Amino acid sequence: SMSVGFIGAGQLAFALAKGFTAAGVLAAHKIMASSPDMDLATVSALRKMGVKLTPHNKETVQHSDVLFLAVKPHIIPFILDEIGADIEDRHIVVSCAAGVTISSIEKKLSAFRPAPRVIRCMTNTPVVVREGATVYATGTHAQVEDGRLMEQLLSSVGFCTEVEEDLIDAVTGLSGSGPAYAFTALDALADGGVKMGLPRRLAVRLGAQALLGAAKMLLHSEQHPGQLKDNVSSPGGATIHALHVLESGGFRSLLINAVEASCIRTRELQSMADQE
Amino acid sequence: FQSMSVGFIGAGQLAFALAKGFTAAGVLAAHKIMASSPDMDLATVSALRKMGVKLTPHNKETVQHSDVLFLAVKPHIIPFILDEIGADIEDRHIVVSCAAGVTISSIEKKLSAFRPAPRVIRCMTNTPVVVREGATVYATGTHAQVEDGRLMEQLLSSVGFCTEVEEDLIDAVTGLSGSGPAYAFTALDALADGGVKMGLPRRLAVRLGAQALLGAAKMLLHSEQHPGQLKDNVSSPGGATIHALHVLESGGFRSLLINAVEASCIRTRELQSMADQE
């Protein structure tokens, strides 16, 4: 029954729309997405899914019950000025934009109607295979059932939980950027397999299966990742020799550096936006 | 395969992980599984008992019970248990060695002193078979029948990915997907430390980091695109992800994971060469 809109018909709109329709929670034709350029590739893929496309953001707003903001963060103020007069009391406005605060969104929208229902979320591209990692925070006028509705919807495409808004920039550096850390690691592990004599295709398949299985083990275990590691490492054995060379390069410190750098850049960009 | 009895020589981490995976998959009833260990007071033995798996101190009883016999002892114990139960191997047995490094030829040579034509398969797997997401390769031995490889692939596919390989790939597979979960646990612990540094509670940071790794791995498995293209899709221009990828690159992140696979593979080969010297 629910009509869903995406302002911005790009990578994230495609990923969510694919996940929602694969989950069977939405019919593709009950989704509408808008972008200025109707000839983009993401738009073609959405079109082939059966999603409704239009260049006009107002049509997306008028179609939608739940309205996702899926444009780049510096575009958010422009489209809020554009469609703010079109937001109705029935709308739930879900901002997916990195860094952009609920306060900044409500300030724009409240100049039109007084009580906009805003939810901010951070998700990631694996919603496309229904294994996303999603957090959300509720705005000033978001009703209790608004947050419940959004958790049910986003749980259909992965993990979803409510957070205080002040955690979301850190979540962005961990699970928002996290898939890229994983793709980098998987490319490098495959190079390692190839160096040691494996065909590339097998090395890619085995590395990716190893990462998936290990992540699932941790999610299903009550034990600390160090204990799961201890269970792998036999005394004198192959694994503990390999963990040593990771440690000698400061492997752990690089991943900490990465989360920190993505979080800090997220905060720094929003600081630029608020100054502007 | 209801007519199939499965046994484990060794009742430790891998025997538990496989028995838990097989029974969760429904391909084996736990009472059709027997496992043996000289220490019936181990945490893995207690876990196997509560599953319904039959337990005995005596390896000979495992052999007599089993059709498919998994060798799940440490690699240096393999020649001792081959000498112990070699005279008990029957024509019906398929011997599946899971031991790192240990060659099919060394196993066949030991068993053939007792009865010619032992049916031997060598595999390398990993602990995530316990959640039915293992990564398993196997190589068939000299006297393994064609049906033996198909049978073993059917059984091991129920607990994850499984494919046949030439034996000379297995030591490298060991360094990639055998040791792989440990690389992942290390990475996930570090990613969680990063989440905590930036203000997340530890439990949430662990959950999100693990989910991000799982989802990305599944994306790559289900996509036709290169990991670099999927990575390019994450990084917006000027954005948070590309800033983070730069600091990974500045530390030689990629080279460390190459070093790891290499070090595990080389150690695997080194240990077997020491065993072959003995």
Add this chain to the structure above:
Amino acid sequence: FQSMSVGFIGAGQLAFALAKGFTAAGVLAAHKIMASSPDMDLATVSALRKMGVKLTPHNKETVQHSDVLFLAVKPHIIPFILDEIGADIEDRHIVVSCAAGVTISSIEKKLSAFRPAPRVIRCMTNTPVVVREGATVYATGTHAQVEDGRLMEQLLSSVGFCTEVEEDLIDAVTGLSGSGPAYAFTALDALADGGVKMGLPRRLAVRLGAQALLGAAKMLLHSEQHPGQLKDNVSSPGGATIHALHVLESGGFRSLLINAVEASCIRTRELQSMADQE
């Protein structure tokens, strides 16, 4: 036994540390202990004398006094004193070698040239036996009776942790708990320097750093949880500890301690290889 007599061949640091621990524990009166060194002017010799330990320059006299005979000379002197005292070993003697690296085989070979069936135990301990918090492992030799191992474990448990191991673990134990105290002394000196840099008086910084290390070690010994979980409990999100852990990780702190255990273990094995060649 409260009638048991104990001897040390080599009245140096370890003989002092064990004798101090045994007597502080009350398991031995100092007068049941005899120690021998060629130089009766050593400081360790004077310290033992003040405790009430019997001293002599003659290793034969220590052998005649003793039931349990500790060998506490430097490893390259072990063959020399075995040649000197071998004809004086009796049926009643338990010979306990504390020497790093020196194998039970090499000791039994020297002593068996004089008299068959020497009862030999090899141990590795560490200096904190002086405060009854040592870490000790032992392996029993070919002719040690079952009660010899139990007696030695009872004695050494009075001054710290003590457990039986296979002899092939002892060189690795040497690199971990034998050299271990030196790693801790280095760490405590540096932690104190950090406290001083941030404005603490040296005496307070030393006291707090050592207390923190002691308490943390005791927590781990008394906990069922992984050290990573205990570390996670210390680290509040965004907080001081997680910031400090990051700078440790950026320097490869963990890899340095792995390097250290490895280097001590490898050196221990290399030194014994040189002795065996000679």
Add this chain to the structure above:
Amino acid sequence: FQSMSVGFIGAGQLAFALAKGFTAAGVLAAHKIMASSPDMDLATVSALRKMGVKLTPHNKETVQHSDVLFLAVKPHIIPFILDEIGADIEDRHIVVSCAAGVTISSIEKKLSAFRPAPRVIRCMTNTPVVVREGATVYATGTHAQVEDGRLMEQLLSSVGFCTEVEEDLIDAVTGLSGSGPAYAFTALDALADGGVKMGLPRRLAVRLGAQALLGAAKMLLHSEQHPGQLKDNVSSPGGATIHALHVLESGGFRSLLINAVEASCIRTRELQSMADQE
């Protein structure tokens, strides 16, 4: 006093650790302790309840129960609970803030708006109070009576080392002994990895590494000698320990621990600067 009543505002890790230590020491019966948290479903809340500690969601009830009132909430919550309970502080109350970074000045300013002359003590402790081996410092506030400091030192000495300091030392103490246990847990995990690399079972490696750290720390606390002298006594010429110390030095081991104390102390000061601005 055996009539003294103790309260914890914030029934989390530190409240559990202190309550466990106080009761294990016998200085307080569990029923003289009350702790409050807004979520009565927390694991720390259940652990305290099993010990016999009184629990309530209402911070006012803890204040009414208590003579000595510990503030054991996260630092940014301190101003919130001072506003909540300030009108309930009485002449009899000793308010002991355990919060990292939070100054006596800021606490006395909030409480004095309700009632003049609050008796305030600030402390910094660490988690090993749970095994009665904490490291604790305290500074007395403007209106603390002389016996208030003595009472607090007597109480906190029951669970470890405790001494009075000037308040301007506490942020540095935080970086040394407050974060200290986490440095030790990291070191012990890595030492165990080294033991495992060289062939030790994990459980034995963890046990020996922790015992070595504990014993070394106890040696230093009981010795009059410099940690460098104790280190010198471990290092035999040409031997295993001095080889291992070299590889520590080549990685700048000492500098990493200095970096850590500094980073924790600086972060502690920075967090309080942010609070003071707010």
